[PDB]
Amino acid sequence: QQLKDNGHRALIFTQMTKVLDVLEQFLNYHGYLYMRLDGATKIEDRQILTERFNTDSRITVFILSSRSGGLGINLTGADTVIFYDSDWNPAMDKQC
Amino acid sequence: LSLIAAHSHITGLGLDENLQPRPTSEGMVGQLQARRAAGVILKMVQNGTIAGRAVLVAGPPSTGKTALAMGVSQSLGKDVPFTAIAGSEIFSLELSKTEALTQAFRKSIGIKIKEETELIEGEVVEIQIDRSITGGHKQGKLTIKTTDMETIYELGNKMIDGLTKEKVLAGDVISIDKASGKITKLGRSFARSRDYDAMGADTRFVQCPEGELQKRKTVVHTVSLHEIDVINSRTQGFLALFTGDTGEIRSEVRDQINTKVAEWKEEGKAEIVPGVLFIDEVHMLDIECFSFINRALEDEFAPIVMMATNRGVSKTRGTNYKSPHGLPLDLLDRSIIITTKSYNEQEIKTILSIRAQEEEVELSSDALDLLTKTGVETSLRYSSNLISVAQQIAMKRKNNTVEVEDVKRAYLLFLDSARSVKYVQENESQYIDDQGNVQISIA
Amino acid sequence: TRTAAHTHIKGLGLDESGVAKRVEGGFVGQIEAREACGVIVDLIKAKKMSGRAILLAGGPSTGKTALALAISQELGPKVPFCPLVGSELYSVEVKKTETLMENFRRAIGLRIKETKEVYEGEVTELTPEDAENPLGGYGKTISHVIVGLKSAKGTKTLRLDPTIYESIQREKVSIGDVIYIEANTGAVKRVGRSDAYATEFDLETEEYVPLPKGEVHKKKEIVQDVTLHDLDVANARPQGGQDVISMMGQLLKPKKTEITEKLRQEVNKVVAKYIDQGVAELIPGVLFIDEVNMLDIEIFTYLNKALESNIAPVVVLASNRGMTTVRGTEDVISPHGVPPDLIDRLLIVRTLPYDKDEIRTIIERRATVERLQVESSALDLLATMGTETSLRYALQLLAPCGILAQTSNRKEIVVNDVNEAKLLFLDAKRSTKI
Amino acid sequence: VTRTAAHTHIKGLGLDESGVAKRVEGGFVGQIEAREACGVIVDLIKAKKMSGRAILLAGGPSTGKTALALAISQELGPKVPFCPLVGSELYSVEVKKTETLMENFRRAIGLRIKETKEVYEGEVTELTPEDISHVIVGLKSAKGTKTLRLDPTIYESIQREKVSIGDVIYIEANTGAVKRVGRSDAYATEFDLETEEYVPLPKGEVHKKKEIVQDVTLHDLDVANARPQGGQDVISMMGQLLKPKKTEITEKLRQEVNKVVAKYIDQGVAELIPGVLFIDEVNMLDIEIFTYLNKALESNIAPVVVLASNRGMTTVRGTEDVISPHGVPPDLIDRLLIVRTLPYDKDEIRTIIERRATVERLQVESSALDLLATMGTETSLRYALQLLAPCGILAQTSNRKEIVVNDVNEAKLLFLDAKRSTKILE
Amino acid sequence: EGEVTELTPEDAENPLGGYGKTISHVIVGLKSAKGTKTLRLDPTIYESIQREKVSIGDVIYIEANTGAVK
Amino acid sequence: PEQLTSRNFVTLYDFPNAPPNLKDFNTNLFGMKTVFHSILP
Numbered sequence A: 001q002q003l004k005d006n007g008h009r010a011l012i013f014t015q016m017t018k019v020l021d022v023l024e025q026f027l028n029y030h031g032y033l034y035m036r037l038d039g040a041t042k043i044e045d046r047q048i049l050t051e052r053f054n055t056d057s058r059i060t061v062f063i064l065s066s067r068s069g070g071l072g073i074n075l076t077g078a079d080t081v082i083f084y085d086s087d088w089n090p091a092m093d094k095q096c
Numbered sequence B: 001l002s003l004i005a006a007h008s009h010i011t012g013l014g015l016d017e018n019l020q021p022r023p024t025s026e027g028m029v030g031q032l033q034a035r036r037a038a039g040v041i042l043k044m045v046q047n048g049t050i051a052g053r054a055v056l057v058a059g060p061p062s063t064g065k066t067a068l069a070m071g072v073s074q075s076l077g078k079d080v081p082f083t084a085i086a087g088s089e090i091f092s093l094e095l096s097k098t099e100a101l102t103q104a105f106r107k108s109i110g111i112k113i114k115e116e117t118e119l120i121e122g123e124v125v126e127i128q129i130d131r132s133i134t135g136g137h138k139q140g141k142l143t144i145k146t147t148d149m150e151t152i153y154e155l156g157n158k159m160i161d162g163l164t165k166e167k168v169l170a171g172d173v174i175s176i177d178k179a180s181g182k183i184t185k186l187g188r189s190f191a192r193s194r195d196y197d198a199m200g201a202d203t204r205f206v207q208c209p210e211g212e213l214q215k216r217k218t219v220v221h222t223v224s225l226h227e228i229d230v231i232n233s234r235t236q237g238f239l240a241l242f243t244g245d246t247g248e249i250r251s252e253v254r255d256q257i258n259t260k261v262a263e264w265k266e267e268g269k270a271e272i273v274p275g276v277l278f279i280d281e282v283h284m285l286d287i288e289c290f291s292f293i294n295r296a297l298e299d300e301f302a303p304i305v306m307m308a309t310n311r312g313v314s315k316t317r318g319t320n321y322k323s324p325h326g327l328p329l330d331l332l333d334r335s336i337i338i339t340t341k342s343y344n345e346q347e348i349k350t351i352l353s354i355r356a357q358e359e360e361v362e363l364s365s366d367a368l369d370l371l372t373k374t375g376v377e378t379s380l381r382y383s384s385n386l387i388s389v390a391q392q393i394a395m396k397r398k399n400n401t402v403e404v405e406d407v408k409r410a411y412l413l414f415l416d417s418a419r420s421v422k423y424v425q426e427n428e429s430q431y432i433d434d435q436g437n438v439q440i441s442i443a
Numbered sequence C: 001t002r003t004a005a006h007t008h009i010k011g012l013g014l015d016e017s018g019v020a021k022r023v024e025g026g027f028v029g030q031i032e033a034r035e036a037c038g039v040i041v042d043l044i045k046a047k048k049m050s051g052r053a054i055l056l057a058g059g060p061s062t063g064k065t066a067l068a069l070a071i072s073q074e075l076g077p078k079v080p081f082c083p084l085v086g087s088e089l090y091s092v093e094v095k096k097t098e099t100l101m102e103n104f105r106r107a108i109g110l111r112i113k114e115t116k117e118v119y120e121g122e123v124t125e126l127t128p129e130d131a132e133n134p135l136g137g138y139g140k141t142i143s144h145v146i147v148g149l150k151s152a153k154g155t156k157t158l159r160l161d162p163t164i165y166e167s168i169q170r171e172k173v174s175i176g177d178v179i180y181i182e183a184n185t186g187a188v189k190r191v192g193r194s195d196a197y198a199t200e201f202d203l204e205t206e207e208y209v210p211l212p213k214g215e216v217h218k219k220k221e222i223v224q225d226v227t228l229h230d231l232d233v234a235n236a237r238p239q240g241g242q243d244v245i246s247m248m249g250q251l252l253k254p255k256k257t258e259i260t261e262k263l264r265q266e267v268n269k270v271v272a273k274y275i276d277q278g279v280a281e282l283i284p285g286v287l288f289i290d291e292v293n294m295l296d297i298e299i300f301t302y303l304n305k306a307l308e309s310n311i312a313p314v315v316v317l318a319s320n321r322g323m324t325t326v327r328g329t330e331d332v333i334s335p336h337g338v339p340p341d342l343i344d345r346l347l348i349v350r351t352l353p354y355d356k357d358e359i360r361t362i363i364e365r366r367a368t369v370e371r372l373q374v375e376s377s378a379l380d381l382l383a384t385m386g387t388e389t390s391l392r393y394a395l396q397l398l399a400p401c402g403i404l405a406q407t408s409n410r411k412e413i414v415v416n417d418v419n420e421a422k423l424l425f426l427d428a429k430r431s432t433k434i
Numbered sequence D: 001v002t003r004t005a006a007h008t009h010i011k012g013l014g015l016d017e018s019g020v021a022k023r024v025e026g027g028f029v030g031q032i033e034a035r036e037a038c039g040v041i042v043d044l045i046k047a048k049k050m051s052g053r054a055i056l057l058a059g060g061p062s063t064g065k066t067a068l069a070l071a072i073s074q075e076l077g078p079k080v081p082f083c084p085l086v087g088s089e090l091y092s093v094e095v096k097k098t099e100t101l102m103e104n105f106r107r108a109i110g111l112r113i114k115e116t117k118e119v120y121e122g123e124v125t126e127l128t129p130e131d132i133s134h135v136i137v138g139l140k141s142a143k144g145t146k147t148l149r150l151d152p153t154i155y156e157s158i159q160r161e162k163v164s165i166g167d168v169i170y171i172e173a174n175t176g177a178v179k180r181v182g183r184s185d186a187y188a189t190e191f192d193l194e195t196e197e198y199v200p201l202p203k204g205e206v207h208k209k210k211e212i213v214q215d216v217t218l219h220d221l222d223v224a225n226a227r228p229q230g231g232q233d234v235i236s237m238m239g240q241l242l243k244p245k246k247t248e249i250t251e252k253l254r255q256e257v258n259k260v261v262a263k264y265i266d267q268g269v270a271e272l273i274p275g276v277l278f279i280d281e282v283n284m285l286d287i288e289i290f291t292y293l294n295k296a297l298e299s300n301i302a303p304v305v306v307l308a309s310n311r312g313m314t315t316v317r318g319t320e321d322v323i324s325p326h327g328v329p330p331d332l333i334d335r336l337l338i339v340r341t342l343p344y345d346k347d348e349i350r351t352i353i354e355r356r357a358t359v360e361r362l363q364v365e366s367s368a369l370d371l372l373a374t375m376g377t378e379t380s381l382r383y384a385l386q387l388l389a390p391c392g393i394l395a396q397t398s399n400r401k402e403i404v405v406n407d408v409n410e411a412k413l414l415f416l417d418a419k420r421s422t423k424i425l426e
Numbered sequence E: 001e002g003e004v005t006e007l008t009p010e011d012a013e014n015p016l017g018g019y020g021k022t023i024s025h026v027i028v029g030l031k032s033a034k035g036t037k038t039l040r041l042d043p044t045i046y047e048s049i050q051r052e053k054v055s056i057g058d059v060i061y062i063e064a065n066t067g068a069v070k
Numbered sequence F: 001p002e003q004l005t006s007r008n009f010v011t012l013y014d015f016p017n018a019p020p021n022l023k024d025f026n027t028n029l030f031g032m033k034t035v036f037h038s039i040l041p
């Protein structure tokens, strides 16, 4: 709520897909426009949705899987990142 | 919607911060012990912790017990339920006495569920709805503006239908609820371009709203426990909320509602605001009603019950033995009794003056003294009723003040109980006796 | 042409800033009671008080019901008067308390004054004027729709807004139709074809209505009268249609129901809103409960509670009893039939018995009302019987005397006819002896 | 934070394993013999063997009968059905007193059953009527898609829920209930402003199957087999708005329901949990209710009904010349076992007042508590119990936490007892 | 009453004669233990026959008092 | 001299920004042989 009031767009990083589903349900109840990136995303679809998030300014929250970040992709359009849960490997958070 | 009624002159119990009754405040005069006890019960209700207490108000007629109840209700104010019923109201034909008492008890417990809603408010700039003739596809966009921002929304089918129904135009300031979907026309921003029909019906302009176009607001839904029970009793119970004919709701419904509301309270979803149930003339209730009251006061979801009685020792209805207050000893054992006393001459005089102020009747000093003497002699309520008739008599005389002669005329025209009894005893042959005999002729 | 028992009671017959005239308005005597009823009527007209009770106390044949009817006539037909007998409260469909409350709210009335501007007339022209499109697009746009209406000694052309096209299509109006269009709402309604085209077709199902008079633009003030009971019943009743609730309502006969306090409070809230808006005015009214002795103690207790309601009418009660036990009680002997708790909340007016001259004047005025002629000796004998047996006995005996006189080809009532009727029709006392 | 009632401090019977009752446990003080008897009754109920057994809690007013009943309910636990009642509650106007008594009898008998729920949920991808005709619906989820054929009732439910392509629904196969949970997330950005509330696409397979254990009563089965009770179809609406009032259920329906329950138990899918029916103030019952209670107790499937009365040598309601020990006719008394409840001395009254004060979060000084105990002994125990809240309110108004003697005296002068009010009347 | 042997609905000689379907009389042949009879029926009776779902070989029952087909 | 006023406009057009038929426009804004002969013989 504070981030949306301030005009910042948040990035949710979690560790397991079930938490992705729970978060999706929560933010769907709260009406936030969003897109989700998961492990099962296709390569072309992954790139296209990354470009969509970078270009579109109407989706406030964007959800990632922390483990899938090992293959990095440009996400310069963000303004704040939220770590729902922590990982044992700090380099994964560093690349996130 | 109200008129000048009997207890319209009291706006509360009139107490200090330490529950010490003022000599005269908020419409109440005297009854210092009674007012202090009523304030203690008021604080007990406002605390919201003590459940199912019973309190009795006893005393002679015209001692202010119903006035005390109205003062308690006014001090409670809104948002705290107050259910005023009479003993005669329980005896119904579609419901049992126990069921009617259960519904009356549950009417006094309120449940508040607070919700946060998003509201769009602004002055319309352009509305545009494009619909194909003989086709179901509709496409529309609107531009709603505020003093600091302006934006365009492309609309779905239901929003288009709602705006078409509401007859929204350019010079309209409207509010949109994103959840409910209702459109409220708050007012107009300018005139309608000087068409023929409706020339000058929009002169009452309203200022353009200011701030963020989409702002969050909180909405509180207050519903009594009985309403929830009626809604969940059957599918047609919602109609029964207005029509009546609720039937005898099965006990399982009430138990499940109790459990669900307790869960809501433990979850913070709902706030429970218990209130006060007030029974006028409780001596009319049957002994079965008193037994049910005895048991139902032990429930955790019960309100605080206050009763009024003036019968002294009298026969309890449904039984053949006299009881100390018209009530069985079982109910008296679990109730605290607050007493009321007769009024002095000065208290009667100031009550009469308060009533005259409320009835907008200007009484001269001598007229007020005569009214006070009459009230002490005959009845407080008799003089209270005589005030307005004296005002009307004065108006007939084309005078703006009530003098002694107007009160004398009102006294002559309208009788008290004692004078009527005397006239009946003197002329008993002219009235029908209990044995059904009367003389109609005068010779 | 009909003659009930109170056709001659036209009013209390008081004078402004004065007292009751000896004979006026059909009333003879009862000066004090008439003055008290006059001050009560003034109080009711003031429309500033609620829950005011007066008791008409007196013997039989003393004018109590006549006084209540005089109050009703003096207040006029606009003030809602609700006559009632105490026996009527004992229903079988609902409790007594519900019936009493329904009568209470039937006594309160509401007056709604609405002014509406309307254009009416036969449709003569229907042309939309093209205008430049703000959004371009090479489409055909209309800025106004022109409707020409012709009326009796009047005709005009209107440049209405383009929105009218929907209402015109929905009401399938045409040239020659006479229509009803509200000035501020924008809706239209056709009442039929013009009578000038009734000859164009020999048969046609539609109804041809006469052309409306006056100018096309007419401003009308419509006044409607409703009671709180009417609003409560209308809100508690289904609309009536093809929906399933109305179907089960058709199946199950509508019985009286305990209208909940929530519905009544909603009705009060909407009424208060519209009163504040300036469209509605509240009229308290009078609730007359004759034979209050018949009411039970439960009804009396509920009256005790209901008189304190912030919105309640003026209740007039009448009782011909002395010291009698209150119904539903075993040892409560109270003045009249009213228990002492309710008597403390009301004001009593006495109704005195009559003298020979008053009875004679009443008899002669009643005979005048019944379009009958009586001789002086016959009138004296009739008054003698009225003072001997009963006033109502003679008042009723007037008509059979007239029938006997008419059978004897005579246009006047004579002592012979009076004695013949006396022998034919016995009173209560002579029959009790027999 | 928490509310307090008459029996909020009663947490159980406070009986040890051997059955002897401690002097002060579970919020009880004294009444050792009655607690032991009620523990024996609780063991009998837990045995789940006998039917129609009845006991009577006989004692004077303010002696601890309703508290004992609530303690029995607490000891048995929330699994078992415990139906509270009053003698005045059986005088219904829709159905006769006998039917109400039988319904309460069958409401106190519990049944626990196992049911398998077939559930479908997903985003709608096709709505094709087969032509009142079946509808072919295609449900998609994150793990797969599925196409189903639905009966006309489900089609009517879907039609009245305004379900279109892209909507997410929830069809329960067993009951035929359709709920439109919202619009799919993939269409959230289609329009910038519409009333639709969006939901994510469901996870897992469309066809889900779960096993839930649900507790029902025999009265629930009787009502289910007697009148229509639910549904989103107009047929169900008309069926239930027709014949709305209660009806006098026949013995045949109860016998058939008993046969059904016996079949369920025999298959092992259900277990029976007999419970307790508590009828307080039994003296309000008429002679007919007692007479039918004589026959109802002889039924082979009946709960352990517990009765409470506070009257002695009182005549039975309805009759005019039958003087009975507790307002209960001798025919029913022979069917009952009487548990006598004894008055309280001063020390136990003092301890009860102390514990009640502790429960309501009040602080009472020892001398003030002694005065409260002695005035409860003089007038009434419940009178002393109700004086605590006004005393606390008075103390708070004086910016003082603990209750003092002066506050108690002020509360006594404000609120009166029955004897004092009667004396004032005299 | 009898067993249906024929059911031959006939239309009007001219299409303009009636409205819509323009159905004229229907011819039905019933068989009994003593012989057969060919009946000429109103279109209302044909509608009743269709409502009761009567085919060739079914035993039917027509009341001339009321026009009811069973 | 009025500052702001609200106008209303109604238009009929085809998707390729083309106007419709004039008579059809006027009909849509607002909304030979025998077919049945009977004679008794």
Ligand SMILES: Nc1ncnc2c1ncn2[C@@H]1O[C@H](COP(=O)(O)OP(=O)(O)OP(O)(O)=S)[C@@H](O)[C@H]1O
Pocket (backbone or CB within 6 Å): C005, C006, C009, C026, C027, C028, C029, C030, C059, C060, C061, C062, C063, C064, C065, C066, C067, C318, C319, C320, C362, C391, C392, C395
């Ligand atoms: N003062 C009066 N002047 C003229 N007619 C009168 C007068 N008082 C009574 N009447 C008539 O006398 C008849 C009987 O009187 P009512 O007033 O109708 O009865 P009542 O006096 O109310 O007695 P009860 O209570 O009805 S038995 C009616 O026809 C009245 O119109």
Ligand SMILES: Nc1ncnc2c1ncn2[C@@H]1O[C@H](COP(=O)(O)OP(=O)(O)OP(O)(O)=S)[C@@H](O)[C@H]1O
Pocket (backbone or CB within 6 Å): B294, B330, D005, D006, D007, D008, D010, D027, D028, D029, D030, D031, D059, D060, D061, D062, D063, D064, D065, D066, D067, D068, D309, D310, D352, D382
């Ligand atoms: N032995 C006890 N120990 C603790 N609290 C008790 C004890 N006995 C009674 N109480 C409490 O004191 C109050 C007495 O009420 P009850 O126990 O219902 O007495 P009762 O026998 O039900 O009287 P009746 O018949 O209902 S009028 C209740 O609040 C009880 O919780």
Ligand SMILES: Nc1ncnc2c1ncn2[C@@H]1O[C@H](COP(=O)(O)OP(=O)(O)O)[C@@H](O)[C@H]1O
Pocket (backbone or CB within 6 Å): B006, B007, B009, B010, B027, B028, B029, B030, B031, B060, B061, B062, B063, B064, B065, B066, B067, B068, B351, B380, B381
């Ligand atoms: N203490 C008081 N202060 C102000 N007004 C009072 C007081 N006591 C009584 N009254 C007035 O006198 C009348 C008494 O009415 P009520 O309270 O109904 O009498 P009762 O106590 O017999 O029910 C009321 O109209 C009330 O306005």
Ligand SMILES: [Mg+2]
Pocket (backbone or CB within 6 Å): B065, B066, B067, B308
């Ligand atoms: Mg009162």
Ligand SMILES: [Mg+2]
Pocket (backbone or CB within 6 Å): C064, C065, C290, C318
């Ligand atoms: Mg009368």
Ligand SMILES: [Mg+2]
Pocket (backbone or CB within 6 Å): D065, D066, D280, D281, D308
């Ligand atoms: Mg008890």
